[PDB]
């Protein structure tokens, strides 16, 4: 909307359109957490807090009127800036097919780690708890290709004592996955037809259920690009967003110690 | 709605209808603050916080990604209980026209002071500031019937240096008003045709403008009555509500020191 | 119109609309002269002089061809600048209801004295004469509440020896009006049903007739706001206007000496 002052920057339609496509491609492969959690739809640029449904009592013991306060979670807002070069950007109109956009890509890669760190390890100043802190759901595994199958078979018998079902997914580390490569068809069918995700963000493995409604991400505004000011022969732009995160049912998650 | 468990109490329609009318009459004359402020419509039993439109920065000085948190005001919830007598309540069906309801009236009178205290003096634990703490809007007055007219004429020349207009109202203490009784027609027309409100809640006088949009009260749920449990030969009931308060433009208010 | 370069400033529609309303309110109460004089409609941004209907002869005494020049009044143009803060202005989109606009109000108050000074005391370099320089229309008054009524009754017998009639108005000083407060209904009906105006711009009183067509103010362009240039993190704006003033019939004015 209008709060991103896009019409006041000296660029053309083709130049604006060439900048969005490059960032949309990297955001699609570098956001690992968004592949197995739920997303609650956007509320707007004015939303500020999300309700927790409880009261805390502050009055004394022997009083006629008694009172307290309600509870909530506050959202987080971010902002990051970069700069580009005008004479280099202007060859697109003469007809050059490969213009150099190298400052955009480093910033796009650094913004993507900030969100995954909050999802996997919490914040401690906004009141958020991450996935790797629930230490009461753990089983010890070994380091031979048979132990992987044995641990996967043992993990589905704990989901049964509760009423948990649905498709199941494996999330594992990319250096560990190299030494288990000979057994790939066996795992997929022992998982009853699930899927595997490799990532550099953790050091061990975890198993989750995907029936729906256990891990949610709340958004106010999605990721956006805007204009700030002009310099000698460069231009200055920024990226922004607002969000928060929550875990509801901790019985759909299991950690593998290795 | 259903969260007040009214259908599970052993009473009839006439008995329920006779209890609401008595409280509705006292609430209409004992709520003094609601006669010159604005009321924002009810949102519901789940509303929890109201937005302040600002951000607070928490990151360090030299970083690539910078962040902060948004700001809000939390609401207040109250609850008060009382008890009544069944054999006495049952004479309404035999045809008695004056049944004794004496425990209801003390509780109704004590709930009404709690709200006026917040409006006139703040809370200090929810982050609320009341009307009598803005000390930069004050003028000294005297104690002779001419000084009242002189101070009222002086107070309308300060409203003019800003763009403030509209009808004006006087709020004064009831023991002070006794000694100014001979001049009543003069005040009403010197006020350009305003109105006067006497109250036991303060000790001096104040003047306010009533053009609209300067002092607001935000409600989640209005004042309601519900049922709790049964005892030997009595029944137990309660009253409840949720709210908060704000002052926007401090240039529509003036205090008279006397 | 287009000579105010409004489209080149980095603001939104709501931000522009919030700035006009605040100035429109103060201009409505701080322009005292415009309450009893006439206004001749606007001519445009190119108007330059207004005709006086006379000729001045410059040739010699014994010549066959004789000649001279015509006479006029030139208009006055003004300009005043101020600056504002962008991050503070940007909270209106997050939802803040009271944004601080403190530099605008001082400039608006200082522009309003400049016009009243010309109307009440003349210019001496454009050829303008003000209301307080016609010294042949004066009567001496006293300082007791009866002398006010006596002087008002005497002043209406001078309007009768000429053919002057119509409603009559009193313009008086605000510290003097305090000591005459007990007689207010008497004055209004002795004035035959007129009106009273209090002001801090003079030191005595005057009486004028309001039949129409004796004191006129000529405008080229009304009061307007425009954009100049951008700074580090602020923006710079200005206010402008063009006008002149004239008195036609000096027999509709009387001064009270006190
Ligand atoms: C032939 C020629 C073409 C140029 N084209 C551009 C251009 O497309 N964009 C640009 O910013 N500067 C261009 N410049 C340079 C630019 O005019 C100048 O060096 C700086 O903008 C400072 O005046 C060009 C210079 C020359 C000699
Ligand atoms: C003639 C009579 C009428 C009564 N009516 C009522 C009544 O309307 N409501 C009531 O709670 N108790 C009533 N009681 C008393 C009640 O039955 C009893 O004392 C207590 O409820 C304990 O059993 C009545 C008792 C008598 C003797
Ligand atoms: C979270 C955050 C939000 C900001 N929002 C704004 C803004 O709305 N307008 C603004 O001019 N500057 C804003 N700034 C600061 C701005 O980017 C920077 O300090 C100066 O504009 C110089 O780069 C913000 C900074 C942070 C950290």
From Swiss-Prot, chains A, B, C:
Residues engaged in binding FMN: 79-81, 87, 90-94, 228
Matching InterPro entries: ENCAP, Encapsulin_nc
Temperature remarks: Optimum temperature for protease activity is 90-93 degrees Celsius.
One Pfam family, short name: Linocin_M18
GO biological process: intracellular iron ion homeostasis; iron ion transport; proteolysis
A Gene Ontology molecular function term of the record: peptidase activity
Record-listed E.C. numbers: 3.4.-.-
Activity regulation: Proteolysis activated by calcium and cobalt.
Transmembrane segments: none
Alphabetic keyword roster: Encapsulin nanocompartment, Flavoprotein, FMN, Hydrolase, Ion transport, Iron, Iron storage, Iron transport, Protease, Transport
UniProt key word Transmembrane: no
Broad enzyme group: hydrolase
Record text on cofactor binding: A flavin ligand is bound near the 3-fold axis channel; FMN is consistent with the observed density, absorbance data and mass spectrometry.
Reported function: Shell component of a type 1 encapsulin nanocompartment. Assembles into proteinaceous shells 23-24 nm in diameter with 2-2.5 nm thick walls. Cargo protein Flp (ferritin-like protein, probably stores iron) is targeted to the interior via its C-terminal extension; empty intact shells can be isolated in the absence of cargo protein. Fe(2+) may be able to pass though the 5-fold and dimer channels in the protein shell. Protease that exhibits activity toward chymotrypsin and trypsin substrates. Probably does not have antibacterial activity.
Subunit structure and binding partners: Homomultimeric. This encapsulin nanocompartment is formed by 60 subunits; monomers form 12 pentamers which assemble to form shells. There are 12 pores where the pentamers meet as well as 3-fold axis channels and dimer channels; none are larger than 3-4 Angstroms in diameter. The N-terminus of the protein is inside the shell, the C-terminus is outside. Probably 3, 4 or 5 Flp cargo decamers bind inside the encapulin nanocompartment.
Domain notes: Has 3 domains; a discontinuous peripheral domain (P, 13-39, 76-133, 221-254), an elongated loop (E, 53-73) and the discontinuous axial domain (A, 137-216 and 259-263). The E-loop forms contacts between two subunits, while the A domain mediates contacts in the 5-fold interface. Pores are formed by residues 184-189, pore size can be modified by mutagenesis.
Name of this chain's protein: Type 1 encapsulin shell protein
Source organism of this protein record: Thermotoga maritima (strain ATCC 43589 / DSM 3109 / JCM 10099 / NBRC 100826 / MSB8)
Gene name, Swiss-Prot/TrEMBL: enc
